[PDB]
Each structure stands twice: as structure tokens, then as C-alpha cells.
Amino acid sequence: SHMRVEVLDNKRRIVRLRPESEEDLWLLRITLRPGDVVRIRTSRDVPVGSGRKERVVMTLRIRLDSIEFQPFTGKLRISGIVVEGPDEFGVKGRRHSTAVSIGTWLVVERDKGWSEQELERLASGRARGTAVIAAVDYDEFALAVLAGHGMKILEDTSARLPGKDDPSREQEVEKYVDRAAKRIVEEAARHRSPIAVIAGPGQLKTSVAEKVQRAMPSLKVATVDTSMGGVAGVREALRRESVTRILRELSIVEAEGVLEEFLRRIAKSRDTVAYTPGEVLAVARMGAVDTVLLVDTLLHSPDDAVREAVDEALRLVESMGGRVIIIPGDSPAGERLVSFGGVIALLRYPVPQEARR
Amino acid sequence: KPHMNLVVIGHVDHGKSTLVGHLLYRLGYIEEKKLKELEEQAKSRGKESFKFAWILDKMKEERERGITIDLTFMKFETKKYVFTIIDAPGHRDFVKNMITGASQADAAILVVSARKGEFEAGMSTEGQTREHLLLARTMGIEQIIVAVNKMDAPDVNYDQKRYEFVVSVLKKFMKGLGYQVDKIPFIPVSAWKGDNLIERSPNMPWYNGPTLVEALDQLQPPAKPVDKPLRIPVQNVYSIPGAGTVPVGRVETGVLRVGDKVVFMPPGVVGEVRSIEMHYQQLQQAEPGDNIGFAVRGVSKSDIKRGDVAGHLDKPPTVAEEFEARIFVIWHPSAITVGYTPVIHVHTASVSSRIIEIKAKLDPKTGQVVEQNPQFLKAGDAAIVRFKPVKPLVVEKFSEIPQLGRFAMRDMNRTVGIGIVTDVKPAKVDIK
Ligand SMILES: Nc1nc2c(ncn2[C@@H]2O[C@H](COP(=O)(O)OP(=O)(O)OP(=O)(O)O)[C@@H](O)[C@H]2O)c(=O)[nH]1
Ligand SMILES: [Mg+2]
């Protein structure tokens, strides 16, 4: 149900753990850092012996160099320079690149020590699942899969339908909805979705909804009114009140609220927001941060200074009662963030610009 | 005998479809057995006062609702003119379709209800008398006839006091949009009864102004930009037996001839024009303002869609990789920033586009650059911004082909902004 996490040494530098869900894999993405040394049982191709190779399962300690996550693949890609292994194979100094899959045991050693918030973060993962969202109108149909940690478009399609006067226009829209229902079922199945949010203007969405309910009767099927179909509709639906409630446990969705509020303040009460790594650290030190919205790519920036600033600021706001929310760059909200350097913050009180030093 | 396109606009249910339907019936364009069959059909199902509207509304969801969803096209003529009248949806969920109608139009009939509560709905901050007047303006319609309607309703009853009020309110707003309001008719009518459609209405002796048909003949037909490269935004695509696949659209610029080879942008598909039909009439060429179907050899219905634009291979429609625009923010609840992605409505197309730069805030009175790269924009700032369409989009500089270079910015069922395009960064032409 969540990542088992057990601290091995008295110096609390070494932790054994086992991802048991993709959210656990995401938790590793936002937690692990370059310099961490991991230890897995992988395997590699060794030249034993004469002109021949054998694939040998072996345990290595790798100084992490690269941590990479792509949603809906169930894989955390990792890479680095091997710092220890069976000496009979001479792997030290050589790059190992593998993937941590769900269920893969791995031990990781952090020199600075594993903080207590970090350990808790790691174990937090409620294996919250997945949802699918579609939007349909007479022009377009689009379908997406949603998780806490990512969003992926699965279908984008003009309904190259006749104009309304056309004879058997009724038949062609009937085929259209059938197509849309069949896709919504296929992906909800493929992704183990309990919930299917079906959006759009007017009755098309409910024609579609009825048919997918009938094919997956245990599925939770919610219609949402929305200005249009297609991808823009899926994105609008993420902002409607009903969906924000149903999907409230998803970061991608919760981000939308704090971005809406952030923009409101940009317009109406400017000194109560901050953005940019540097500014957010500044106001996080004051104790001014109520919540911080942060794209995960900042956690893994190639600039050491900004990784340290961001992790610090985040350590700070957590310690003084604040909420921290990490989202993928690959999300509607995460794309709005890039203009603000990838982090925004809602402040508890007005901090003047002259004071953010 | 000159041709013009009429788009019928206004708030939801203020009577656009009955007004068009009845006008056609009176003018002699609908058979008795048909208007009566519809009367039976209507009454038979929920709807009842819809027999006139149902000679436009024919979609399944449309009849059940009973709402106009997508444009309807009909032909008729007056003494001076032959007309394509375009019946637009009023419901806010379908203003994208009203917009494609407005871009096609030479002139608009604004239908506004005088009924207590109704008129106020449509003229409210979020109502569609207001929205459609805005959109018509930004889409380049400068000839407008307003029909003040439902004059027979119990709560109006031909009252000149009411008429005068709605006109007052209407005129104020339209004047601020930039309309020379005194040069445009406000015709008290009953779409349902027929008051002031064709002949004078006994019930409203105080009017004396022109009837609807009269107002129609006072319209002056637009200019015909020949010697501009051919542009036909496609409104719909049909697979028709005897013809093949035929796009339908209004010729915006240039001239099309049977036998011409034509390219559809952005798909880059090419085909040869086999035929041209307008109002069921065979043409050998289509001039600007013509609203045509044209059969295209070598292209299939899955290759091209609404929002694509046809042109000669010679000089193909521009596909904007990026574009620059002078905009004005009508409404937005907070701050517009870089990254904001409204949907852009131009000619027959609607494509979301990411603001990738706010180059400048402009003085709202004299237009000088007042701030470069401002943090944000609000209603009602004027700015120069750069856009990046999220899918390929045909746009054209306003100074070159205006009808392909004026647009509304819409987000979240609201009209947020309007703009004209000042620069285009063309994508590389690909051809098939
Ligand atoms: N009394 C009276 N009723 C009218 C008049 N015009 C329209 N109505 C009624 O208003 C209702 C709306 O009719 P429609 O023609 O569908 O109005 P619409 O503006 O075309 O509707 P949408 O296209 O969906 O926005 C119908 O029940 C009509 O009978 C009128 O002039 N007088
Ligand atoms: Mg109608």
C-alpha cells in the first residue's frame, strides 16, 4: 500500500526500501539526489571467458549520476559510476545504468544523513491510482490519463463529421460516440482507472458516458459541463469545481487551485506571492510561506546551487507549517510555472520587494 | 443582382431562428405542407412554438433542447439582393460556431428580445447580446440591423416605451464599440406573429422606420478583393455522391475556377477543383463573397477539416509557427501572463495558442509603448504579444488579408480578448 522504509545504521545514513507502486517510484524521483549511492541487484555482461560473454546477476553500489521518471511506465531510470561490486569482474569506475521497477529492493546511502521529513515523505505514498478524462463535442474528442504524478494525452481527434444538413448525420454521430466510448473503456481498463471523467458542452458527453457505464458498470463515471471538447476541454475540466473535488487527492489537480490564487494575487495583492528559486528561499526563511508549488525538474536541476536552494526553501516551509506541492513539468499547471522559474509561493502576509534579500 | 452573407446573432432564445424561418415563409420560400408538418411534429413532441425555428434547427440535440447548435444556411432574395442568411447559435456553449458565422458574414441581424428579464439577460456582463456584438465587431462586421423582437409578448405588447428603452441601452454600448449607431436601424418586430418583417405592422403606428426587408435593401455590398491571393477558409467538409469530397466555405480573397489546383493549409494536401456549386447552382468561377461548395479530386474527407484554408499552390495560405498581435483584454479575472494559453478564433478556425512573450503594454488612449515586457496584463490593457499555436494554424497579417488576421481570444467559456495580427513567423511549406 506504501513504500516500506527502514533505516539501517545508527548514523541514519543508510535506508533500505522497496517501491510497491508507481507513486513510490515518483516519491523516489523527487527524493533521490545526485551523489546518493544506491545498491541494487542488477546484472551485466561480463567477458568470462574466451571471446564469450555471460550475463551475470550481481550487486553493485552506484554513485547516482542521473534519476529519471516518465509517468505510466512503472520504471525509475537510474544511472551512475559504479563505486563497488564483486572484484572478480572489475566494474568499479564503470557506468551502470538500469531501472528501478516496482518491487525492486534498493539500499541508498546519503552522506549528509536522512532527515526525518525525507523518511516520512518516502512512506507517505498512498497508492492512489489513476483516472481518465475525456472531452467531446461535434468538433473534437480527446482522452487523457491522470495520476498524482503525471498526465498523458491518449487520444486527440477531429470528429470529421458531416455538417448538420447531411442525410444520415445522425448515424455518423452515433458511430462517433461509440468510438469515443470504446476508447474510454480501453484506456480505463489499460490503466486500472476507478474513475472516468467525461466532459463537454451539451448531450454528447452523456451519450458517451451512458455507453461506457454500461460496458464497465463498476466504474465511477462523472459528466462535467465544459465549453468545448478536445484537449482544451480536458484542461478546462481539470478546473471545474466538480472535478477539483472528485480528483482533489491528485497534485496535478490541486496545483490548479494554488495557481488560480497565485494569479489573483499577482493582480490584486502582489506582495503576498513569490516566485523564482531565489525569491522563494528568501521568503521561506522569513516564515512567510503558506504553500509552495514546485515543478519537479527544479529538484534535479544541473546547477548544484539551485538544487540546494530549492531543497532548503522546501525544508524551511515544511518546518514552519507550510504545504509543499511538487508536480511534473509535464502538466497543465507545470507548464504555466516555467515562466515563473518553476516555483511559486503563496505568502501568509505581505512581504515588500525591498525585503526579499 | 449582388450577393451578401447575413449572420443572425443574439442571446439564447431571443428568436433568431423563428425570425429567419418566418421571414422566409412570408417571402414565399417555404411550402404550406412543410410548415404545417413541422407544426404537427413540434406540437407532438415537447416543443410547440418552434415550428418556425425548426425550419432551421434540424440536429437531434437541437430539436430536443431546443437550441441552435451549428450554423444553418439558406438562400433568398429581395428587390435589390440575393442573400445567404446564416442562422447562428445563441447558447454560450456554442459561440465558437457563432464566430465562424460572423467571419463569413457581410452583415448581421442582431436579434434582441424586449421581454422583461430577457433583454437584461442578454445585455448583462455575461450575456450574448453583448458578446455577439463584441465578436461581430472584432470579426469585421460593420453593417448591422437590430431587430427588437418579441414585441407581441404579453409583457411587452407593442409598447413604444419598452422599445425605446432597449434601443437606448443598445445604442450606448454599440457606440462604445465604435459603431456609428445613428446610421443603423432598430426595427421593432414580432418574429412569431410577423410584425414588421415584410409589411408595416398595424399594432405599432409609432414606428415609421423601415421594415426588416426594407432594412435589408439598404445594406451596401462590400468590396471584392480580387488581385489578392486566393483564400477560402473551409467551414465544413462533405462526402457527396456524384461529387466526391467537397469543402464548403466563403471565398475571402482572389478567384477560384473549375480546373484550378488548390492546396489546403495546414495539412498541405493538394487536389484539383472539379466543380463549384453555390445555392445549388453550377458556377465556373467563384468571386470573393461567394459561399460555395467545391469538389476536389484527389483529396479525401479525412485529409481536410473546418478551419483549414484553401489557396492556389502559387501562393499558399500562411501557416504560423508563431505570430505577433496587437491585442486588447476585454475580461479576465486576474493576471494574464507569458504561458497563458487561450484559444484563438480566426476565420473558421479555433486553436489554442501559448503567449510566449508580452512585448509591450500600450497606452490605452494614444497607443505608445508604455512598458516593455510587463509582468502581466489585466482587463483592459492593450498590448503587443507573441503567440505560439499549439497545433498548426493558418493566419495572415491584418494589413495583408484582414479577414484571416483578426481574432478573438477565448478561455473558459468567456471572451477574454480581441486582436489583430501584426506579424507572422511562417512554418515551412510541406506539400502532398
Ligand atoms: N411571443 C414571441 N415569442 C417568440 C418570438 N420570437 C421567438 N419566440 C419564442 O422564443 C423561443 C425561442 O425561439 P428560437 O427561434 O429557437 O430562438 P433562438 O434565438 O433562435 O434560439 P437559439 O438559437 O437557441 O439561441 C421560441 O419558443 C419562440 O416561439 C416573438 O417574436 N414573439
Ligand atoms: Mg436558433
d(CA A192, CA A181) in angstroms, rounded, equals: 16
Q: How far is CA B97 from CA B48, B68, B69, in A?
A: 26, 10, 8
B16 in a labelled binding site = yes
Note the CATH architecture for domain B225-318. Answer: Beta Barrel (2.40)
Q: What residues does B269 pair with on adjacent strands?
A: B264
Considering the domain architecture, whether residues A136 and A245 belong to the same structural domain is answered as: yes
Distance from CA of A235 to the nearest CA of B (A): 10
Other C-beta atoms within 10 Å of A237: how many?
27
Do A93 and A65 form a contact (C-beta atoms < 8 A)? no
Task: Please answer yes or no on whether A336 and B61 come within 8 Å at the CB atom.
Answer: no
Is A100 in the same domain as A135? Answer: no
Give buried/exposed letters for A303-326 (b at 16+ CB in 10 A, else e): eeebbebbbebbebbbeeebebbb
A245/A267 same-domain check: no
Structural element, H or E, at residue B213: helix B212-217
3-class secondary structure for A289-325? EEEEEEEHHHHHCCCHHHHHHHHHHHHHHHHCCCEEE
Is there a contact between B309 and B233 (Cβ–Cβ < 8 Å)?
yes
User: Do B1-222 and B225-318 have matching folds?
Assistant: no
Q: Are B65 and B52 in contact (CB under 8 A)?
A: no
SS3 assignment, position B343? strand
Q: Residue A274's domain spans which residues?
A: 251-357
**Domain segments of chain B: what residues?**
1-222, 225-318, 319-426
What's the CATH superfamily of B1-222? P-loop containing nucleotide triphosphate hydrolases (3.40.50.300)
**Ligand-binding site membership of B90 (annotated):** yes
CATH of domain B319-426: 2.40.30.10
Atom of ligand 1 nearest to the CA of B11: 25
Taking the CA of residue B111 as reference, the ligand 1 atom at the shortest distance is 19
Ligand 1: distance of its center to the CA of B194 in Å?
A: 13
How far, CA to CA in Å, does B148 sit from each of B114, B162, B166, B191, B431?
A: 6, 10, 8, 9, 50
Strand, helix or coil at A224? strand
Secondary structure class of B100 (helix, strand, coil): helix
Element (H, E) at B250: strand B244-250
Residue with the three cell numbers 434582441: B112
Query: Is-contact A54 A46, C-beta < 8 A?
Result: yes
Chain B partners of A201 at a C-beta cutoff of 8 Å? 93-94
Cell numbers linked to B258: 473549375
Assign residue A201 the CATH number of its domain.
3.30.420.60
Q: Which of B240, B303, B242, B319 is nearest to B271 (CA)?
A: B303
Annotated resolution, angstroms: 2.3
Breaks in chain A after residues, C-to-N cutoff 2.5 Å: none
Show which residues on chain A lie within 8 Å of chain B, measured between beta carbons.
138-139, 158, 160, 162-166, 169-170, 173, 201-204, 227-228, 231-232, 236, 239, 260, 263-264, 266-268, 335-339
- What long-range pairs does A30-34 form, CB within 8 A, spacing at least 24? A30/A121, A30/A296, A30/A299, A30/A326, A31/A118, A31/A121, A31/A122, A32/A64, A32/A67, A32/A78, A32/A108, A33/A64, A33/A67, A33/A110, A33/A299, A33/A300, A33/A307, A33/A311, A34/A64, A34/A65, A34/A66, A34/A67, A34/A300, A34/A307
Q: Using alpha carbons, select from B112, B171, B108 the residue that is nearest to residue B141.
A: B108
Nearest residue of chain B to residue A334 (CA atoms):
B339
Q: For residue B64, how far is its CA from the centre of ligand 2 (angstroms)?
A: 13
CA distance A33 to chain B (A): 29
Radius of gyration of chain A (CA): 24
Closest Cα to atom 30 of ligand 1: B150
